Amino acid sequence: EPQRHTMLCMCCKCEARIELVVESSADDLRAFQQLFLNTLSFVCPWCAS
Amino acid sequence: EPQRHTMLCMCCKCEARIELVVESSADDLRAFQQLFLNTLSFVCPWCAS
Amino acid sequence: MDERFRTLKKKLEEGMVFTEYEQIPKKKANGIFSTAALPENAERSRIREVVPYEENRVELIPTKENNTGYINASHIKVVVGGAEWHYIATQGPLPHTCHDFWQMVWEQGVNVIAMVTAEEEGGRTKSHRYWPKLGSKHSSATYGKFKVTTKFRTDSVCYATTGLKVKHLLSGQERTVWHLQYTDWPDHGCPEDVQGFLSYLEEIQSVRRHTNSMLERHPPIVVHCSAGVGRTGVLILSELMIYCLEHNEKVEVPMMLRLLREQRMFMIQTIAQYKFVYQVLIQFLQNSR
Amino acid sequence: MDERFRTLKKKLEEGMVFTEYEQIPKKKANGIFSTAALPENAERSRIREVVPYEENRVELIPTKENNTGYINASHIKVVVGGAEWHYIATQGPLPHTCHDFWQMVWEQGVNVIAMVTAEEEGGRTKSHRYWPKLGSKHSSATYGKFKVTTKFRTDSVCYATTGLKVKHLLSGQERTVWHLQYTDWPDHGCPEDVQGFLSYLEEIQSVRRHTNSMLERHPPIVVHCSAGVGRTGVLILSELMIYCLEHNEKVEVPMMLRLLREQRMFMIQTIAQYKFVYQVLIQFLQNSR
Ligand SMILES: [Cl-]
Ligand SMILES: [Cl-]
Ligand SMILES: [Zn+2]
Ligand SMILES: [Zn+2]
């Protein structure tokens, strides 16, 4: 069954830390981790507005 | 070059809408979309606390 | 493609492309519409005048309420360069045909829906809302035997991509469907932003290859507008001609339109839509240089 | 594995597993440590007494400041069931050997670092912080020729997984490294939560297979603690014995320990660590039933 995981990352615009909380299978968690090691970056709410 | 994209999804605990803003390549965007169609779900900040 | 660009431009300067369009018959002379013509199926067609030919209508498994398995939808099949292309051209679902629509999606193994319209345009209904709204009722809705759940939406400038999960409520089987909605078509006439329409075609092509790779076969994509012939015909003709140009097949646009009309009546219903297709092809070729 | 479970339990009841541990020599009799023994390399070893044998030390490309290409690190190679296993066992980097460490990671094509320690434990330094902190200086840090960037961290109960990007500043080449840090080892003795250590081994196994699949070969993983022999030996012996049990190879634990000691002196430096390995194997076998 899916479990809860927390992903810590950095906003790609302003160096602020972003806390993402997901529920997923282990395989989908690994796939999501791998996206951060490709090109996927998150924008914090402030930089988004 | 990476572009800015917005992903709208639902919290898996409380039905609230979540707006995720990413920058990524097209391929990593598609891979991220596919994770939502597998098991990956996000938890809103309130349900996280 | 430089020779293809110059050839296309010359033909557009010869003054006959609109002449030959008028002479393309809008529908087959000895056409048969037996099931669509039944009085039990009158209310299942949005536009009474636009119905599938009997030989290639999409036939659903019969049910007690829909015993002829009727939906206003046609199988469109064209072979270009050794490749078979398969589309289902259909009307925008009515409130009472949403379960038929999802039944068709299931039986045909459809992975991609190309919706070339808004739900309402200028006050008139073009399509029922046949997929859920995010955050409304667990982002889910049930249409007959099918529970549909919206998992994400990504808005682009000219179109929106929505990922759906479809569950068959008797078997429990779940499947993925990608819903690609063009949002830039004006209430009358054709879109002025040709590049945006090309971006939409790009997304359809990209999502088709993605879903095909996931199933590691090539089901039809569903294309619909209001009656399933106008904007639907623009999309299908454009994709087929862009592929013809990209792989250098010597098929003329009016010849391709004749073959589409052999399979669904009235495909591309105005000269303005036909001229729009040519401008799509010109822009695609200019993009290449 | 039921016969393997009962066999292991019987051996633990025979009262000789600690007897045979004492008789395993801590290091090779005719061992040679030429490069580690040079006075220029004294400051490069965290624990002066724990150094690599010459024949299997990890040799770096020479530089003007480090002309023997010396790092306190050993190649550990064991063949189990037709499969070669390759580890690099090394000490926790010192402030002035962080660039050596990343040079080793680059030359050896390492994808996975297993760090079985905290940076400081009970006030004493066990490892320099050789990877960046999230959000601090663009989450990046430079060590000699290598720019390292932290992209994510996922905290589990007993360990943390950090994804890193490593850039070679002369070629511009970028690579991925996964940093897996066990956070549950007590300041003295061995962890009471055996299941948590098994979860850490699970993550190492899972990340190794992931990184191997991405490179669609099998580089060594790097394992380090403070001197690179104690907890490092516990991890390596445990993974090798779990694989031996899972594929039913008749290798005794003391025999495997002797082979590890043939390759790096002092591997598993206390009886309590050796007994911990047996409890890891017992728990793995109980998990199977
Ligand atoms: Cl004309
Ligand atoms: Cl004993
Ligand atoms: Zn920001
Ligand atoms: Zn919530």
Number of the ligand closest to the Cα of D272? 2
- The CA distance from D254 to D20, in Å, is 7
Tell me which chain A residues have a C-beta less than 8 angstroms from the C-beta of D134. Answer: 8-10, 17
Q: Does the distance separating the beta carbons of A39 and B28 come in below 8 Å?
A: yes
Number of the ligand closest to the Cα of C15? 1
In SS3 terms, chain D reads as CHHHHHHHHHHHHCCCHHHHHHCCCCCCCCCCCHHHHCHHHHHHCCCCCCCCCCCCECCCCCCCCCCCCCCCEEEEEEEECCEEEEEEEECCCCCCCHHHHHHHHHHCCCCEEEECCCCEECCEECCCCCCCCCCCCCCEEEECCEEEEEEEEEECCCEEEEEEEEEECCCCCEEEEEEEEECCCCCCCCCCCHHHHHHHHHHHHHHHHHHHHHCCCCCCEEEECCCCCHHHHHHHHHHHHHHHHHCCCCCCHHHHHHHHHHHCCCCCCCHHHHHHHHHHHHHHHHHHC
Ligand 1 centroid–CA C275 distance in Å is 9
In order of D204, D242, D245, D256, D260, the CA distances from D285 in angstroms are 19, 9, 9, 18, 23
Q: Which residues surround ligand 3, an ion (CB under 5 A)?
A: A 11, 13-14, 16, 44, 47
Give C 100-139 residues with CB within 8 A of chain B. Answer: 134-135, 138-139
Contacts of C84 (CB under 8 A, 6+ apart): C77, C78
Q: Does the distance separating the beta carbons of B24 and A41 come in below 8 Å?
A: yes
- The CA distance from B30 to D175, in Å, is 22
Give A 11-30 residues with CB within 8 A of chain B. Answer: 12, 19-25, 27-29
* Minimal Cβ distance to B15: which of C135, C152, C154: C135
C159-C162-C168-C169 Cα dihedral, nearest 10 degrees: -120
Tell me which chain B residues have a C-beta less than 8 angstroms from the C-beta of C163. Answer: 33, 36-37
Check if the beta carbon of residue C165 is closer than 8 Å to that of residue C148: yes
- The CA distance from D235 to D244, in Å, is 14
Tell me which chain A residues have a C-beta less than 8 angstroms from the C-beta of B35. Answer: 24, 28, 31-32
Sign for the pseudo-dihedral over CA of D278, D179, D27, D49: negative
In order of C245, D4, D25, D199, D280, the CA distances from D275 in angstroms are 72, 18, 17, 19, 9
Q: Which helix (H) or strand (E) holds B36?
A: helix B26-37
Asked if A21 reaches chain D (Cβ–Cβ under 8 Å), the answer is no
DSSP string, C183-201: ----SSS--S-HHHHHHHH
Do the two chains D and C touch, given a threshold of 8 Å on CB pairs and at least 3 pairs? Answer: no
* Minimal Cβ distance to A21: which of B24, B38, B43: B43
For chain A, domain boundaries? 1-49
* Minimal Cβ distance to B17: which of C134, C154, C176: C134
Q: Does the distance separating the beta carbons of B39 and A24 come in below 8 Å?
A: yes
Identify whether C225 is a catalytic site residue. yes
Ligand 2 centroid–CA D274 distance in Å is 11
In terms of Cα–Cα distance, which of C167, C45, C155 is closest to C106?
C167
Which CATH number does the domain B1-49 belong to among 3.30.160.330, 3.40.50.720, 3.30.70.100, 3.60.10.10?
Answer: 3.30.160.330
- The CA distance from D243 to C82, in Å, is 51
Check if the beta carbon of residue C238 is closer than 8 Å to that of residue C116: no
Q: Which string of b and e fits C96-131 if b means at least 16 CB within 10 Å?
A: ebbbbbbbbbbebebbbbbbbbbeeeeeeebbbebb
The tokens of A30 are what?
Answer: 């690994």
Give B46→chain C minimum CA distance, Å: 16
Determination technique for this entry: X-ray
C161-C167-C173-C176 Cα dihedral, nearest 10 degrees: 0
> Which CATH number applies to D1-289?
3.90.190.10
Asked if A39 reaches chain D (Cβ–Cβ under 8 Å), the answer is no
CB atoms < 10 A from the CB of C28, how many?
Answer: 15
Q: Does the distance separating the beta carbons of A28 and B39 come in below 8 Å?
A: yes
Give D 220-259 residues with CB within 8 A of chain A. Answer: none
Q: Where are the alpha helices (DSSP H) in chain C?
A: 2-13, 17-22, 34-37, 98-107, 194-214, 230-246, 253-263, 271-288
Q: Does the distance separating the beta carbons of B6 and C176 come in below 8 Å?
A: no
Q: Which residues surround ligand 4, an ion (CB under 5 A)?
A: B 11, 13-14, 16, 44, 47
- The CA distance from C178 to C114, in Å, is 9
Distance of CA C236 to the CA centre of its chain: 7
Breaks (C-N over 2.5 A) in chain B follow: none
Residue D267 C-beta-side C-alpha neighbours within 13 Å: 33
Check if the beta carbon of residue D211 is closer than 8 Å to that of residue D218: no
In order of A24, A26, C169, the CA distances from C173 in angstroms are 20, 22, 8
Tell me which chain B residues have a C-beta less than 8 angstroms from the C-beta of A20. Answer: 42
Ligand 3 centroid–CA A19 distance in Å is 12
Check if the beta carbon of residue C239 is closer than 8 Å to that of residue C204: yes
Q: Which string of b and e fits C145-167 if b means at least 16 CB within 10 Å?
A: ebbbbbbbbbebebbbbbbbbbb
Q: Which chains touch B (3 or more CB pairs under 8 A)?
A: A, C
Do the two chains A and C touch, given a threshold of 8 Å on CB pairs and at least 3 pairs? Answer: no
Contacts of D49 (CB under 8 A, 6+ apart): none
In terms of Cα–Cα distance, which of C153, C207, C165 is closest to B6?
C153
Contacts of C196 (CB under 8 A, 6+ apart): C157, C158, C159, C184
Give the resolution in Å: 1.8
- The CA distance from C201 to C234, in Å, is 11
The tokens of D173 are what?
Answer: 């080449």
DSSP string, A1-49: --EEEEEEEE-TTT--EEEEEEEE-HHHHHHHHHHHHTT-EE--HHHH-
